[PDB]
Amino acid sequence: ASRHGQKGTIGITYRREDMPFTAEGIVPDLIINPHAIPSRMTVAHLIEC
Amino acid sequence: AKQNLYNAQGATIERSVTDRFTCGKCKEKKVSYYQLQTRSADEPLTTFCTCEACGNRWKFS
Amino acid sequence: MIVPVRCFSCGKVVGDKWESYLNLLQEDELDEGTALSRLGLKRYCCRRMILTHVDLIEKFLRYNPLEKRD
C-alpha cells in the first residue's frame, strides 16, 4: 500500500529483460495501472511522485 | 384575498437547469440534475438526472 | 541494518561506498547532492539507495540478545 489509500496485490513478477526501459537503462521496480487515479482523485500521489 | 390566494400555494421545487444530458423519453435537453457523494467512497460521486419536460428519471455513476 | 550491497534496480554495487560517503559529509563539509555525485552515483536509483538509508546497526550494537525489559 501507498500512503494515499491505494493498496493492491502482486499479480505477476517479471525479470529485467521483459521490463520496459528508458533510454538511460532504468527499470521500474513496479508498475501500477492508471485506471486507479480518476475516481479516487488522489492528486497527492502524483504530487508526491 | 390576494394574499390568501398567494399563501394557499405549495412549495415549488425548481431544479437547476442545464443543457448537456439528453433525455431518453422526449429527448428535450432541458433536464435538471442533482449530484452527491452517496455511493461508497470507494467509488466516485453519483448523479441523478430528471427531465423537466416529460418526467423521465435516470442515474449515472 | 547494514547498507545494502547492491542496487535493487540497476544491479550496481553501492555497499562499499557508504564508508567513504560518510567521510565527505563532515570532513569536507559538502552538501548531499555533490557528495552523492562525487562517487559516480548518476542514476537517481543509486542516489535513492544511499540517500535514504537508516543505519540501525549502531543501536543494536550497544545492546545484548539477553535481557531487554518492557
Curated annotation (Swiss-Prot), chain A:
Leader peptide range in chain numbering: none
Subcellular location as annotated: Nucleus
Family under the similarity heading: Belongs to the RNA polymerase beta chain family.
Misc. comment: The binding of ribonucleoside triphosphate to the RNA polymerase II transcribing complex probably involves a two-step mechanism. The initial binding seems to occur at the entry (E) site and involves a magnesium ion coordinated by three conserved aspartate residues of the two largest RNA Pol II subunits.
Function: DNA-dependent RNA polymerase catalyzes the transcription of DNA into RNA using the four ribonucleoside triphosphates as substrates. Second largest component of RNA polymerases II which synthesizes mRNA precursors and many functional non-coding RNAs. Proposed to contribute to the polymerase catalytic activity and forms the polymerase active center together with the largest subunit. Pol II is the central component of the basal RNA polymerase II transcription machinery.
Quaternary structure note: Component of the RNA polymerase II (Pol II) complex consisting of 12 subunits.
Protein name (database record): DNA-directed RNA polymerase II subunit RPB2
From Swiss-Prot, chain B:
TFIIS-type zinc finger span: 19-59
Protein task: Necessary for efficient RNA polymerase II transcription elongation past template-encoded arresting sites. The arresting sites in DNA have the property of trapping a certain fraction of elongating RNA polymerases that pass through, resulting in locked ternary complexes. Cleavage of the nascent transcript by S-II allows the resumption of elongation from the new 3'-terminus. Can promote the transfer of one strand of a double-stranded DNA molecule to a homologous single strand and thus may be involved in recombination.
Note: S-II binds to RNA-polymerase II in the absence of transcription. Present with 6260 molecules/cell in log phase SD medium.
Location of this chain's protein in the cell: Nucleus
UniProt-annotated binding residues for Zn(2+): 23, 26, 51, 54
Organism, scientific name: Saccharomyces cerevisiae (strain ATCC 204508 / S288c) (Baker's yeast)
Protein's UniProt name: Transcription elongation factor S-II
Residues of the full protein shown: 249 to 309 of 309
UniProt similarity note: Belongs to the TFS-II family.
Curated annotation (Swiss-Prot), chain C:
InterPro entries associated with the record: RNA_pol_su_RPB10, RNA_pol_suN_Zn-BS, RPABC5/Rpb10
Covalent crosslink: Glycyl lysine isopeptide (Lys-Gly) (interchain with G-Cter in ubiquitin): 59
GO molecular function annotations of the record: DNA binding; DNA-directed RNA polymerase activity; zinc ion binding
Main location: nucleus
UniProt keyword terms in alphabetical order: DNA-directed RNA polymerase, Isopeptide bond, Metal-binding, Nucleus, Ribosome biogenesis, Transcription, Ubl conjugation, Zinc
Job description of the protein: DNA-dependent RNA polymerases catalyze the transcription of DNA into RNA using the four ribonucleoside triphosphates as substrates. Common component of RNA polymerases I, II and III which synthesize ribosomal RNA precursors, mRNA precursors and many functional non-coding RNAs, and a small RNAs, such as 5S rRNA and tRNAs, respectively. Pol II is the central component of the basal RNA polymerase II transcription machinery. Pols are composed of mobile elements that move relative to each other. In Pol II, RBP10 is part of the core element with the central large cleft.
Assigned protein family: Belongs to the archaeal Rpo10/eukaryotic RPB10 RNA polymerase subunit family.
Record-linked HAMAP family: RNApol_arch_Rpo10
PANTHER family for this protein: DNA-DIRECTED RNA POLYMERASES I, II, AND III SUBUNIT RPABC5, DNA-DIRECTED RNA POLYMERASES I, II, AND III SUBUNIT RPABC5 FAMILY MEMBER
Miscellaneous comment as given in the Swiss-Prot or TrEMBL entry: Present with 5300 molecules/cell in log phase SD medium.
This protein's name: DNA-directed RNA polymerases I, II, and III subunit RPABC5
